Design a protein around this ligand. Sequence first.
Ligand SMILES: CCNc1cc2oc3c/c(=[NH+]\CC)c(C)cc-3c(-c3ccccc3C(=O)OCC)c2cc1C
Lengths: 156, 577, 580, 575
Amino acid sequence: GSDLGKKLLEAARAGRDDEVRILMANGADVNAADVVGWTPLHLAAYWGHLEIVEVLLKNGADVNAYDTLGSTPLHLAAHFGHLEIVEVLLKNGADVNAKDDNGITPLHLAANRGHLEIVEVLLKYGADVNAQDKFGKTAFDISINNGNEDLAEILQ
Amino acid sequence: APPAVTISASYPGADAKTVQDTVTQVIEQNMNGIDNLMYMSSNSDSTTVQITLTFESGTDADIAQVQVQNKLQLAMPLLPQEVQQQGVSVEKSSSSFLMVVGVINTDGTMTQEDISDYVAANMKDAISRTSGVGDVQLFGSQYAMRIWMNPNELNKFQLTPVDVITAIKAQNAQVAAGQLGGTPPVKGQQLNASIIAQTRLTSTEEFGKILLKVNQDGSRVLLRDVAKIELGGENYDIIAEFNGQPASGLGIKLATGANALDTAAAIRAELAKMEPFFPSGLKIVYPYDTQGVFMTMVQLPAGATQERTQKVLNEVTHYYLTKEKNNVESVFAVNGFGFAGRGQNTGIAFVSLKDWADRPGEENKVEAITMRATRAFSQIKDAMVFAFNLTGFDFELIDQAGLGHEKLTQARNQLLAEAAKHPDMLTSVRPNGLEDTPQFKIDIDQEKAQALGVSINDINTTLGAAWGGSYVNDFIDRGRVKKVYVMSEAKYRMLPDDIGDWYVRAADGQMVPFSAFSSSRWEYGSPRLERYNGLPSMEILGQAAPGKSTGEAMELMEQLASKLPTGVGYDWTGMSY
Amino acid sequence: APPAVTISASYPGADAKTVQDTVTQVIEQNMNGIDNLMYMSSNSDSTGTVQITLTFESGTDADIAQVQVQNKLQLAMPLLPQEVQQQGVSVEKSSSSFLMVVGVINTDGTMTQEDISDYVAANMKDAISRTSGVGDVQLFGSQYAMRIWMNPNELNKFQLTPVDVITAIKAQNAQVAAGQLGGTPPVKGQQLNASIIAQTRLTSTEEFGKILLKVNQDGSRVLLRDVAKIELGGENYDIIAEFNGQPASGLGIKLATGANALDTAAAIRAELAKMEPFFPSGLKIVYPYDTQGVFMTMVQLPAGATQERTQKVLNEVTHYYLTKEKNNVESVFAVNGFGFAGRGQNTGIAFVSLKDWADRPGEENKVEAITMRATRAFSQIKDAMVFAFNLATGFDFELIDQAGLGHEKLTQARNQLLAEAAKHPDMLTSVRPNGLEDTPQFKIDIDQEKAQALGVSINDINTTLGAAWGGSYVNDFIDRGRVKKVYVMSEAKYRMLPDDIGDWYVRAADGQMVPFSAFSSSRWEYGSPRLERYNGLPSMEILGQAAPGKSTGEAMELMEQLASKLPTGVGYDWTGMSYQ
Amino acid sequence: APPAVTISASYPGADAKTVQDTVTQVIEQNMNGIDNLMYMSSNSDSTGTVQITLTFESGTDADIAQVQVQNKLQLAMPLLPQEVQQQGVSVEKSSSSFLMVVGVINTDGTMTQEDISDYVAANMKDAISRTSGVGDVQLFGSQYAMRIWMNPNELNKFQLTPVDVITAIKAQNAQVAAGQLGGTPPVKGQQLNASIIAQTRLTSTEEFGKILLKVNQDGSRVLLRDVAKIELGGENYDIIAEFNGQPASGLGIKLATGANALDTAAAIRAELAKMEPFFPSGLKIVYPGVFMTMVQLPAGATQERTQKVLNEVTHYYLTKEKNNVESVFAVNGFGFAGRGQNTGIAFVSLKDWADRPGEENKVEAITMRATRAFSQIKDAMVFAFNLATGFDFELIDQAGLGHEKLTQARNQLLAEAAKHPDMLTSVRPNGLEDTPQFKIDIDQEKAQALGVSINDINTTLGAAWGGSYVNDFIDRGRVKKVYVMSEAKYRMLPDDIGDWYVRAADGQMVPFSAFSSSRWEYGSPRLERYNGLPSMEILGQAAPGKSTGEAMELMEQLASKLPTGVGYDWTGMSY
Ligand SMILES: CCNc1cc2oc3c/c(=[NH+]\CC)c(C)cc-3c(-c3ccccc3C(=O)OCC)c2cc1C
């Protein structure tokens, strides 16, 4: 974690698009992690800053970065309802069936919060619908436990 | 001033939200039918709760306190058991210190840790009962018996933190056992005597030989065989120094309405009674007395460690002990305590100058020194370091429609963005609170926990005792009542991968690691949730730009606010009311 | 009048006798060594409520009286049932009557009464209660709670009890302190410092829906929604307001003893002005009672009377003002389930506001004539004691049990006194009891021996019975940012009739479900729904008016004579107007 | 005077150290933030009792003080044990003494002091405390409690413990909320609306006797009757009150600040004349001008022994001074600087000053004589007296030394005050001395090997030997307590310990003898603290021809010679 590393991580978090462009042109590591393994792409995917996600990826950011628990920026975007950013990440080669340490996939997360449009974009890009987390659970099982019949219908 | 009563409560190991939703909201919902209350504000930290009720100018501070204490007494049973046992305080006092009573050990026989317990066990209470003394803040902690649990050894003998706690409550008891020949007695009874059964334990020796279980062959598993046992602080958050050496002390606030000068003398008279009986080396030093003194505040960004805050306090101390030798008699510095609040990320330094007569020239007076000092400390990285003696504006952004913390933040951020686009009216419009930070979120899978026969109560006691600590009961240390705390030894509660080394016993006697029924991810949450008149809030400070007045700046802020998302309100408080 | 401190407690699911003997008596016994105390009275209701009123000398410092009363209350707090402590006992120092009513409607009809009452309770009530001068605040409605409406068939089908339900809800709607990573004392060099977030309070009907009750041996899941309906709904369903026939809620605001009526009303309108901008579309404040321009209407049916039956009377009363008095009456704010003398199912009240003084010319159009006409017209209403009045020479008689005679004998000795006062029209007109008559109650007896034989615990029986038929406050949850209560109760249809007792099951130690009828018996008996007390002993308050022209001293003097002839045990005292 | 507020709490069955380290210390630690406090002192004693006395600056509002003190205590109630909260911790201004004392007696010999006290509680006390000018009214006794007097032989016989009896009472003397038929919200169209009434509180000894403890496998029931004697009795039996040898109760009445004593005293006498027609057979009111007689037996001495001596005292006044004495009101278990089975105090009411003519029938002449007569009593100090030159010294533990070292230091100072009888005389402790006590250790290992729970052990011991306030009942429509304790004959001597059995996890009854060991040791029956630290009050006075301030300089001089960690401080009328 160097100085222009920290300047970027913080800037990617707050959505200051100008500042991200500035720091990129002065060689700021696009894979600067913080103490939990969050690259700027993690931060941007979490806090819904679409431009910065494109701009980082454009400057060669790791689309499949792991945090210290196995979780990728796609996971974050799927979990919190950031549709365009899900699309944009998967466009640049985001692993659709990435698993965190618990066996949790972006689909599991999107499913569990009932983010229906994200679920389809995911299925579209090759998303193993019979994936199981550590407790044996599919995105279907999740849809049943949440009484969410619109999703079970999408899952067929 | 307008008088302010301050409620304070605590929840060992709780987060801001837990605190807010089990304590803060509950107290606030019952603070009513109280005369002359202007407004009410509150804080809930990832440490602890402060509710501050500010009354109409002219109000009788005594009544405000009595009335308040009484409504809190009626809410007491709605609070969690853990909170009540710590004991809430309700105080009527100024929010600035009257003085600070430093305590050092010139022979170096006693550590920072030992000194603070001396102060807690022998000095604090008497000073606390001195008339004029509103609040007393210990710069350190009183000793507790610390049971530092080992999870490897606990799992070896199929015990959990639940077993430890159960045994500590059974074997560190004080039993009422009646009497021989007690009343009503049979005719001709000659003997009357007290029955003495178990008494509280007093030593590490004693706690260590608490018997946890007998194995099926016959050997004995004692508490010293699953834990390290030492006297150590109730908390470890606050550490102090006096000219760079280990120290403790008492921040003493003046009771609303008391004589400052008389209270100072009374405090001095009570300390004169104590001195004769100090251990060899202990010595009172007087680092801050209210043209003569000032403070220096240290805010690090939230998520900062004690170790890093100590680095910044060292540079602050160093500057006064080296570059300002001829003006500064002494620096009392405290890691973990800040002018506003507590936490691993803040600190304060009380500075005492040499006799006015030995600092000739306008460049060695208090204004010139503090200014130079702040200029000197502005060249410090990721830390707001500001030195000051003892008016812009004070604005609360209020959640008026159940929006949530995530949403109120965006509305706060949108107001800050707009205020930055008028440099000619508003300068440094900053938020007074803190930012969200990475926190570890762990889900208990109820299905798997049930399938394996693992109690949720045993799970959450295990989690919470190990990682946050748990006040079990009381013990007597050199004749004073003190707390017993069970918590994990530092090394088995530092990293995420350590979660999986804690085992919990199932209904069928088998050990089950947390890994088996838990799952975790990172997320962001608040380390300080604010409330203003019962509702979520965010305090924003700013000042009026040069050659422009308060009212115009306020009028602008009021206009900017009208253009915030639906359900976001505002109000003026403090100086701005 | 003289200053009064009021202790109010609530015990959900409790009958009047249980309330009295478990809450009231215990508090009462500590109410001594209180300076300037004239007298003390109290009611214990089968609505599960106590109201101890302590009345003081004139010129008594109300702040000091409240402190002295509360200081003594604290002696009893630890002896009160935990269920009472948790509801929050209150000590207040207000006038007995309202200063104003703040009404709330929805002009787009998009919010039911239940909704409106939850909005006022969660966004408006507290701020108003904190406003200075506000002695007491009474919500006409009830804040939402999470309602688990259990179905006993479904619970039996899966070998479950309400106890199981309650246990699962305490485990899975928990808010856990889990500590930190990198917390102090750290291992030197530690960089990471993060809070540990474990379970947090549930926020939605959906989250309660999925609470896991059991894994079956065949691997299928039993969720809370499989054995209950789940929804937001009132903490209780006893209080229903209307404004001009439309659904409403509101706040009855009483003035604090000694406070300035005009300043306090100003501060309320100030604090109401801060709220209005953030309302949901449709919501509106209205002002049906300010304090001749206004008057109330008391509505009291006999005990045992349902909510529906009181609603018909309130309908007939609202109808008279809205049809017959249109030219004078501006608004009517009617409340079912809350009346003058506290609360019941059998009680009600209407706040009536007239038009402008200058739109109502004639003596037959002023407050007196109107109230007279209304009162007169309502007198012909059957099975109801309705009268209308704005706000003098009667008496206030307490009949006291002073030899442990009991409630039944005291009723007998009351009636003897009333039937004798019936034979003295010359001196006494309308000697009437101020309280309620005994009504049928369902006495049930747990057979201990059969319970022990079958291996079922009494705690499990009594939790199953109380929770199903009375409700149980389990813990808190968080609704749109605010802390609120979670209540477990039977769905209405399974707690309506006596045969329903047998459909509930308790699980024994050996895993077998035992129906409630295996270990109980029941029979009808009578009993009180408002047990009165005076200066600590069981009492019955009798009201009356001196006969036309006779003085209250001469009326009082005969009541004393009549009372002399009552059985031994039975004394008397004078209260209210008749004390001085 | 200077105003003073007194916090009283009670932990029944508790010894002095238990009360100190569990209640007193905890309350002390929360007595901060209280305005105008000069000093604070407290005693913790073997009868289960704490007195904490906060003394305030002259001219301090004693009502403001009461309130600030009360609120701090209340905020600390959760820190105190359950059994202490349930007794009630009172905070009351202790400044004034009694306006007047009203004794109540029976002349038929048909009523115990428990019986009379219950009558006073239920028929007189409240009416009196409502009387014009009356503040606090203190009962000399309690109301009745339902007493369950357990039998360990009958308990073991049917394989039960006191834990079982307590559970059984909590379940069968219960009154819980059971809701309604057709309660809201109903099904619309509901006609029926009826409260459900399940168990109610029990009302009589009969109903407690029927409490079902268990059903044996042969069919037959075991009732609480079958293992306990059950009777209406007192809340506690530490004190015995006689008026001229007859059973007594009474009311101590105080005057509400503001009000007038002459008008209040007639107001009370009026109010008592009203009740006097309604009394049961032979119940009389008496009114005790007055001097006192102290009684003090040695360490370990019993109630019965103190009562023989009190009776002798009452007899001497009623015979040898029948011309001068009207009454002797005798209190056994209370005195100056004392509570306990070995202390007592007789209040002697004299006749009119008119009818005692001649210097030999005046108070001083009588008391001198009485003191001569009583000095010929074996194993008893008995001083007669009527209530200047003395001091009040607090020896203080300043470094956590503990009781034994603080006693050793008190002795060092007292032996030294003997050597200057020229300046100092009567240098003595105000307090009590250590005394024999019965230490019983539970063997943790043995209890676990047998499957005997420790909580079952400590409840069995405490419930049987110290008594236990289980819950409330309703006696003639009045809420009253229910205590479980052993019948007296099975909790008297050390051998009685082995009679008590405990059921283990497997079902076998295990005697106390199998998992406990015992011995005699010494310990305080009255521990003192001063400004929050352990203390020992020392009293004295200056000799002939010596000012009091000179004698103080010498105490201070010797006191500066004591072991390291021992300090002192001046209190009371030497402050
Ligand atoms: C002419 C009769 N005079 C008195 C008779 C008394 O009888 C008492 C009987 C009691 N119970 C009977 C079952 C109890 C509990 C306290 C009594 C006190 C008492 C109350 C409070 C504090 C101290 C004492 C007390 O005993 O005084 C010692 C200084 C008492 C006091 C006086 C003056």
